[PDB]
Amino acid sequence: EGREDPQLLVRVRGGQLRGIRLKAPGGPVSAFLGIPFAEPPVGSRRFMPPEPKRPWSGVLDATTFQNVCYQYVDTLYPGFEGTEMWNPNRELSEDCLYLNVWTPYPRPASPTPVLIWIYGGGFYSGAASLDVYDGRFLAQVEGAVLVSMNYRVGTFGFLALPGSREAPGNVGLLDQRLALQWVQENIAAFGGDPMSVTLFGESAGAASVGMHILSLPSRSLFHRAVLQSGTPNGPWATVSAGEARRRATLLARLVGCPNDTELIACLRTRPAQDLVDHEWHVLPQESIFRFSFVPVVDGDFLSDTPEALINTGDFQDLQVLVGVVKDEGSYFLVYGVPGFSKDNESLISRAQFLAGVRIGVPQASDLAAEAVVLHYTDWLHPEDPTHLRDAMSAVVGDHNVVCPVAQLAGRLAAQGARVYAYIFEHRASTLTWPLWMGVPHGYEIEFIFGLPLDPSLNYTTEERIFAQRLMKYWTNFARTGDPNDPRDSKSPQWPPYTTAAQQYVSLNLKPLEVRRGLRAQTCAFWNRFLPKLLSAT
Amino acid sequence: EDPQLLVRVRGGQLRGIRLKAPGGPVSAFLGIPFAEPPVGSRRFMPPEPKRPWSGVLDATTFQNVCYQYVDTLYPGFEGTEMWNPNRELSEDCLYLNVWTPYPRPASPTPVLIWIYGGGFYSGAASLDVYDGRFLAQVEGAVLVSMNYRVGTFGFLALPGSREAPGNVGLLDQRLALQWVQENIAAFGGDPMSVTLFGESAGAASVGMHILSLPSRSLFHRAVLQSGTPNGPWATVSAGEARRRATLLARLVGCPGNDTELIACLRTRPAQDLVDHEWHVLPQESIFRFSFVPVVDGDFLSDTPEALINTGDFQDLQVLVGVVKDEGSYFLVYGVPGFSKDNESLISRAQFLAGVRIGVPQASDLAAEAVVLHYTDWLHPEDPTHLRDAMSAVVGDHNVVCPVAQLAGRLAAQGARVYAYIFEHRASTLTWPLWMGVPHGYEIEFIFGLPLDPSLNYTTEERIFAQRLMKYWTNFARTGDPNDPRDSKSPQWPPYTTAAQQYVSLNLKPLEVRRGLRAQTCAFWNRFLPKLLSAT
Ligand SMILES: CN(Cc1ccccc1)Cc1ccc(COc2ccc3c(CO)cc(=O)oc3c2)cc1
Ligand SMILES: CN(Cc1ccccc1)Cc1ccc(COc2ccc3c(CO)cc(=O)oc3c2)cc1
Ligand SMILES: *[C@@H]1O[C@H](CO)[C@@H](O)[C@H](O)[C@H]1NC(C)=O
Ligand SMILES: *[C@@H]1O[C@H](CO)[C@@H](O)[C@H](O)[C@H]1NC(C)=O
Ligand SMILES: *[C@@H]1O[C@H](CO)[C@@H](O)[C@H](O)[C@H]1NC(C)=O
Ligand SMILES: *[C@@H]1O[C@H](CO)[C@@H](O)[C@H](O)[C@H]1NC(C)=O
């Protein structure tokens, strides 16, 4: 200390930090990167709940991103930016429980609402250091304090032998909760308001946010929630205790481990890469949009199934923003549904469609799988390849995202929550995936964080204006529980989603358009009829 | 003394009557016996051909209508009375009628044979809606309609018994068809161009003559208006026919042997049988009738579904279609919350209760499947939507989707198929507006009743009726409803499995549409059978 930037040195509960002054297109921001919030969950602490980071001495350098939690590296289209942008961009390590903070430069004088980002990645992948989650634009343009944390994924975050001491499960969610607690104690040192904390996340990150809504100890750590293209309810976000026990035991056998304590002791001796090499092999069926190690309904973090909790909980004090992208399902068809590729138009046959439905809803009986096929078939053109391709995408997107959030918006709204719903319909001019995928899963994030404002990124001017609109929507919601701008009047209003009117808005380059019904007919099939059909068969 | 009112058929001489139609006279021969009166020991028995008669038989007047139930729902309301018997009831009722132009045609003329509806429990060829004078006068057709036995007298069956073999009401129709072959040429008709057309149960009967091979040599073309041989109501299994007959016999005090049972039923006055007719249905129902054709293994060698799925229909041309609101008429006959005088705005609970009546064969899960399919999930409680959906459940389940299934199966297996939807509501209709275009109210337009100035139709409805008369008669002449003189687009395309094209019959010009309730009928025809099966 002495000759450095005095506006970049801050003290948190664990010691002193030195941040870095970053350039955003419109000015500087303060960045505090790689702050440790837990003891490294390594060695005998693998699979264990996180322990609070013990204080350090001296000034911790917080100028670069820290390790990415150990995870699978996608190799589907090697070197294709569509896949690589999601891949880890630092070293893989079990030592990975660090978080990041962006604030205005200099730091705000008055307490500023806080946004906490929870990344997605199917609970098997992801990192708070990816370019798509760059908090420098929200920090600079909106004056927000943004926090993002790494949490353990895959086996390290979610392998569970339910009821055991050494692998209780959901420790990846406990990693997230510990970071929320860290924001409670320390974010005031940066100018953030701990009494105005909004969680927002996407895909498994959105499901994570929803699970903090449903867990008691997490509810006192935040005040508002945004769930983008993900829900705690639905077919992929959770598994039963019995099913988590079987996948854990099977993976242990696949890595040579054949009493719970002896089992996890052996797992803790295996190299991390051994666990990643086998995690995908324990799914009960050939499937898309399902992940081996996800939150487990333990009777602890989750006292019951998410479906049961959103049916009975009280959410009057809660404001929630939820939505989907236009083509939630298309991204998943290229990862194992025959007939589908990023390099052709993926015009499939009726036979390929029927095979895809068995993969897309792998829990379905033969009768239930039929019911899906009859509903999604266009009976005036039942063999048309373009419709069959688009229907296969819609089946995956509706089943895993659109109808889960349509269900949760309705439940939360009926339990007294303030809900705002959107559909994101703009395809980025920079998108590298083919046209037939439309607006795929995850490609609204770069607009929420305001990447189009980076002039070196070749977005169009209207995409620059568009991203600024979304940034104001998201930050107005964090500030007020209401995405609408108080100053405005002429701009169309975003009404709350209600059971009586089921209103949502389209998010595209045109002004806000209000629509009614979130795929209402088709989601009645998924949310009301199909669960009753599955009991009978 | 009028020589064109005297015709000799193989049973002897007849004298008809000159009738006044708006454009000119017509020869009408009404009350021609085609069968021995099925009375006494001939009750429930197949018809026997009528024996020759001396002198000039007087064919000037409508004969008795077959003994049947007299509807009492809205007593004296024209909407219900127009279907009630308008001649005396009698088991002595096997007679047919013939309309020809006046003078009787020079060249042989294509014959249309009408088969009335009435749920196989009612109906008569003497109703005003079936007045054949307009088609005979305007289009120069030879029009024939017959009475056939309905209710227990037509279709109560002890399957396998000699005394009550079943389907005798259909045999009544077939005998009248043979009569047309042997005699219509004496009236100027062409026995080599005979077109059957009927509505509702009449349409179903037409479809069963398609599916019964001895009938097939008696006609060349068919029109099925708002009814099919396939579907949930038009037939019953032999086991269910024996159950219903056995319970009616017990209800009228008849107790063992097939022969002993049928004998006692023959000793019962007709009204006794009609009194308990309706109390033998297995469930509380709508659009279900107690005594209908039976899958006997004889007249119908298999279920109509099995027969349309495997038959050879190459040499066949068919016209098929529906009205816009097939099911609305049936709701006011037992569905709580529905009334002719009320607007029938129903609650959701009444809607769930109504679906169990409309699909009486449905398990709890199959009823929930229909409920969730037909609910409008943006307005799941709106009573106007729930009312209109109840009418659509009954209409699609019983008519529209059976029609679409038949049309597709016939077209796929050699037949030439033309399909329509009839969307005009008569300005003279007395049912409430919420019923729309109810089951059976295209008939008056096809027979040309608007051309009668005294019935107060609108002038466009007259032009409309003439268009429909030309579609039907051009179909009878050619197997193609398109006017060969008219040389403009749009033409009426055939219905195929691939394109699924049909036309809308309204006061606007013909409009071609593709897919006859395709998504919803996929539910009824493809999914629901599999569900009911595995439940
Ligand atoms: C590429 N990814 C981009 C993305 C979008 C949004 C948020 C975060 C990342 C979307 C995606 C994810 C997964 C798939 C296929 O499903 C998988 C892939 C890999 C695994 C792995 C690999 O070990 C383990 C597992 O349990 O389940 C998996 C399930 C396709 C597309
Ligand atoms: C009145 N009818 C008018 C009509 C329309 C189209 C063609 C012919 C007649 C349509 C109609 C028919 C039947 C009903 C209700 O269902 C019935 C009514 C009476 C019976 C009877 C009465 O004994 C016996 C039976 O087995 O089943 C029935 C079933 C409602 C509306
Ligand atoms: C698209 O490409 C994949 C992989 O090359 C292939 O399996 C699929 O059949 C292709 N589809 C079409 C319609 O060409
Ligand atoms: C933007 O375009 C320029 C040239 O037009 C190119 O050199 C640059 O790499 C592009 N940037 C991105 C992010 O694609
Ligand atoms: C409509 O009318 C009938 C008889 O007049 C009545 O029983 C029925 O309840 C009415 N419908 C409603 C919704 O009240
Ligand atoms: C037609 O209307 C007139 C009154 O304008 C009436 O006298 C006549 O009876 C009506 N005809 C019929 C068939 O109802």
Author numbering:
A (entry chain A): 1 to 258, 265 to 543
B (entry chain B): 4 to 258, 264 to 543
Anything the authors wrote about it?
However, few X-ray structures described the binding mode of multimodal compounds targeting MAO B (covalently) or AChE (reversibly), whereas to our knowledge this is the first study reporting the binding poses of two dual reversible coumarin-based AChE-MAO B inhibitors (1 and 2)20,21 on the crystal structures of both enzymes.
The structures of mouse AChE (hereafter indicated simply as AChE) were determined to a resolution of 2.6 and 2.5 Å for the complex with 1 and (+)-2, respectively. The electron density maps clearly defined the entire binding mode of 1, whereas in the case of (+)-2 only the coumarin moiety could be modeled. The structure of 1 in complex with AChE shows nearly parallel arene–arene interactions involving the coumarin moiety of 1 in a sandwich-like binding with both the phenol ring of Tyr124 and the indole ring of Trp286. The binding of the coumarin group is facilitated by a significant structural change of Trp286, similar to previously reported for other ligands such as the oxime HI-6.33 The para-xylyl moiety of 1 is in contact distance to the hydroxyl group of Tyr124 and also forms π–π stacking interactions with the aromatic rings of Phe338 and Tyr341. The phenol ring of Tyr337 is slightly shifted and rotated to accommodate the tertiary amino group of 1, whereas the terminal aromatic ring forms parallel arene–arene interactions with the indole of Trp86. Likewise, in AChE, inhibitor 1 is fully buried in the protein structure, adopting a U-shaped conformation allowed by the structural change of Trp286 and Tyr337 side chains.
